[PDB]
Design an enzyme around this catalytic site. Structure first.
Site, short mmCIF file in Angstrom:
data_model
loop_
_atom_site.label_atom_id
_atom_site.label_comp_id
_atom_site.label_asym_id
_atom_site.label_seq_id
_atom_site.Cartn_x
_atom_site.Cartn_y
_atom_site.Cartn_z
N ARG A 36 19.78 36.33 16.79
CA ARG A 36 19.37 34.97 17.16
C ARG A 36 18.61 35.01 18.47
O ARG A 36 19.10 35.57 19.46
CB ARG A 36 20.57 34.03 17.29
CG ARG A 36 20.22 32.60 17.72
CD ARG A 36 19.73 31.80 16.53
NE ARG A 36 19.40 30.42 16.89
CZ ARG A 36 20.26 29.40 16.80
NH1 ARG A 36 21.50 29.61 16.37
NH2 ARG A 36 19.88 28.18 17.13
N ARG A 80 15.97 30.34 11.97
CA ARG A 80 16.83 31.29 12.66
C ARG A 80 17.61 32.16 11.70
O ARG A 80 17.89 31.78 10.56
CB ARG A 80 17.76 30.61 13.68
CG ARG A 80 18.96 29.91 13.09
CD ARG A 80 18.60 28.64 12.36
NE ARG A 80 17.76 27.75 13.15
CZ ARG A 80 18.20 26.77 13.94
NH1 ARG A 80 19.50 26.53 14.04
NH2 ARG A 80 17.34 26.01 14.61
N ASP A 139 22.91 30.40 12.57
CA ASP A 139 23.33 29.28 13.39
C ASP A 139 24.79 29.00 13.07
O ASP A 139 25.14 28.78 11.91
CB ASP A 139 22.47 28.05 13.10
CG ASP A 139 22.75 26.89 14.04
OD1 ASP A 139 22.88 27.14 15.26
OD2 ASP A 139 22.80 25.73 13.57
N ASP A 180 27.52 26.38 14.19
CA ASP A 180 27.85 25.16 14.91
C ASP A 180 29.33 24.85 14.74
O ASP A 180 29.85 24.87 13.63
CB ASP A 180 27.06 23.97 14.36
CG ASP A 180 25.59 24.01 14.73
OD1 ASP A 180 25.22 24.78 15.64
OD2 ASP A 180 24.81 23.26 14.12
N1 LIG Z 1 29.56 21.93 18.67
C1 LIG Z 1 28.73 22.92 19.08
N2 LIG Z 1 28.59 24.08 18.43
C2 LIG Z 1 27.75 25.05 18.85
N3 LIG Z 1 26.99 24.96 19.96
C3 LIG Z 1 27.05 23.82 20.69
C4 LIG Z 1 27.94 22.73 20.29
N4 LIG Z 1 27.83 21.73 21.18
C5 LIG Z 1 26.93 22.14 22.10
N5 LIG Z 1 26.48 23.37 21.81
C6 LIG Z 1 25.45 24.04 22.64
O1 LIG Z 1 24.22 23.94 21.92
C7 LIG Z 1 23.36 24.85 22.60
C8 LIG Z 1 22.01 25.00 21.89
O2 LIG Z 1 22.24 25.42 20.56
P1 LIG Z 1 21.13 25.44 19.39
O3 LIG Z 1 21.72 26.28 18.33
O4 LIG Z 1 19.73 25.98 19.91
C9 LIG Z 1 20.94 23.73 18.85
P2 LIG Z 1 20.71 23.60 17.06
O5 LIG Z 1 21.90 24.09 16.34
O6 LIG Z 1 19.37 24.35 16.63
O7 LIG Z 1 20.50 22.05 16.73
P3 LIG Z 1 21.63 20.95 16.40
O8 LIG Z 1 22.58 20.95 17.57
O9 LIG Z 1 20.81 19.69 16.32
O10 LIG Z 1 22.28 21.36 15.11
C10 LIG Z 1 24.24 26.10 22.70
O11 LIG Z 1 23.83 26.95 23.78
C11 LIG Z 1 25.63 25.52 22.93
O12 LIG Z 1 26.02 25.66 24.30
N1 LIG Z 2 18.89 22.29 5.36
C1 LIG Z 2 19.09 22.50 6.73
N2 LIG Z 2 18.27 21.91 7.58
C2 LIG Z 2 18.50 22.12 8.91
N3 LIG Z 2 17.85 21.67 10.00
C3 LIG Z 2 18.48 22.17 11.07
S1 LIG Z 2 17.95 21.80 12.68
C4 LIG Z 2 17.41 20.08 12.58
C5 LIG Z 2 18.26 18.98 11.98
O1 LIG Z 2 19.32 19.25 11.44
C6 LIG Z 2 17.83 17.54 12.01
C7 LIG Z 2 18.47 16.60 11.21
C8 LIG Z 2 18.09 15.27 11.23
C9 LIG Z 2 17.05 14.86 12.05
C10 LIG Z 2 16.39 15.78 12.84
C11 LIG Z 2 16.78 17.12 12.83
N4 LIG Z 2 19.52 22.94 10.71
C12 LIG Z 2 19.54 22.93 9.34
C13 LIG Z 2 20.38 23.54 8.39
O2 LIG Z 2 21.42 24.33 8.75
N5 LIG Z 2 20.11 23.29 7.11
CA LIG Z 3 22.50 23.44 14.12
CA LIG Z 4 23.51 25.71 16.95
CL LIG Z 5 16.38 34.00 15.04
#
Ligand SMILES: Nc1ncnc2c1ncn2[C@@H]1O[C@H](COP(=O)(O)CP(=O)(O)OP(=O)(O)O)[C@@H](O)[C@H]1O
Ligand SMILES: Nc1nc2[nH]c(SCC(=O)c3ccccc3)nc2c(=O)[nH]1
Ligand SMILES: [Ca+2]
Ligand SMILES: [Ca+2]
Ligand SMILES: [Cl-]
Ligand SMILES: [Cl-]
Ligand SMILES: [Cl-]
Ligand SMILES: [Cl-]
Length: 159
Positions: A83, A93, A96, A98
């Site tokens: 990542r 990526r 991921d 979360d």
């Molecule tokens: N519930 C959670 N799980 C994982 N990371 C989290 C989190 N809440 C906050 N973070 C923070 O989120 C930061 C950025 O993570 P990213 O993976 O780049 C965001 P993303 O997953 O692409 O989008 P999203 O949060 O809209 O799903 C991490 O460095 C972490 O510290």
């Molecule tokens: N199918 C899918 N789409 C994604 N998109 C992202 S990042 C952006 C996102 O989830 C979002 C959702 C609603 C509005 C704007 C961004 N992760 C994922 C994933 O794990 N799966």
């Molecule tokens: Ca995410």
């Molecule tokens: Ca994330």
């Molecule tokens: Cl990546």
């Protein structure tokens, strides 16, 4: 022991391989055990759409780690599976991880916001979660079953 629920996504570098590797790595997190793994789903991208379809899944992980310690380990796995932070927001990526929920805890620290701030609006999170935890109730009392019964989400297709 607390049950955490983790969302897994991958859309680069052979998503099936990435997700299987992630599941093995999740099993190696200290003071923790995987309880349940969802099916794998092939999902259209939300946000930017000029990227490959995702493999999405959910896992239930029982743990005695602190929430931020769990985050340490999920970040480690993401980094070890290649990542890398890129310029574009919500871009593709390799992996991921979360943290969707950590028991019924509510957290807003700098590194960690739980429940995941947008999970109630993302079918690719809610459907696999429902598969492994159909009786789930959120920290605010909302029922997962009621969200899915009420809100328009496309059903997911298996990977
Ligand atoms: N519930 C959670 N799980 C994982 N990371 C989290 C989190 N809440 C906050 N973070 C923070 O989120 C930061 C950025 O993570 P990213 O993976 O780049 C965001 P993303 O997953 O692409 O989008 P999203 O949060 O809209 O799903 C991490 O460095 C972490 O510290
Ligand atoms: N199918 C899918 N789409 C994604 N998109 C992202 S990042 C952006 C996102 O989830 C979002 C959702 C609603 C509005 C704007 C961004 N992760 C994922 C994933 O794990 N799966
Ligand atoms: Ca995410
Ligand atoms: Ca994330
Ligand atoms: Cl990546
Ligand atoms: Cl693959
Ligand atoms: Cl959705
Ligand atoms: Cl909530």
């Amino acid at each position: 022991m607390t049950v955490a629920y983790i969302a897994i996504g991958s859309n680069l570098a052979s998503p099936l391989e990435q997700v299987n590797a992630a599941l093995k790595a999740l099993g190696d997190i200290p003071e923790s055990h995987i309880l349940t793994v969802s099916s794998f789903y092939r999902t259209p991208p939300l946000g930017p759409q000029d990227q490959p379809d995702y493999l999405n899944a959910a896992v239930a992980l029982e743990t005695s780690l602190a929430p931020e310690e769990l985050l340490n380990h999920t970040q480690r796995i993401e980094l070890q599976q290649g990542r890398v932070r890129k310029a574009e927001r919500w871009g593709p990526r390799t992996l991921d991880l979360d943290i969707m929920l950590f028991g019924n805890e509510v957290i807003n620290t700098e590194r960690l916001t739980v429940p995941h701030y947008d999970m109630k609006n993302r079918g690719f999170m809610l459907w696999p979660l429902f598969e492994i935890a159909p009786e789930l109730v959120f920290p605010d009392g909302e029922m997962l079953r009621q969200i899915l019964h009420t809100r328009a989400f496309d059903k997911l297709n298996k990977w």
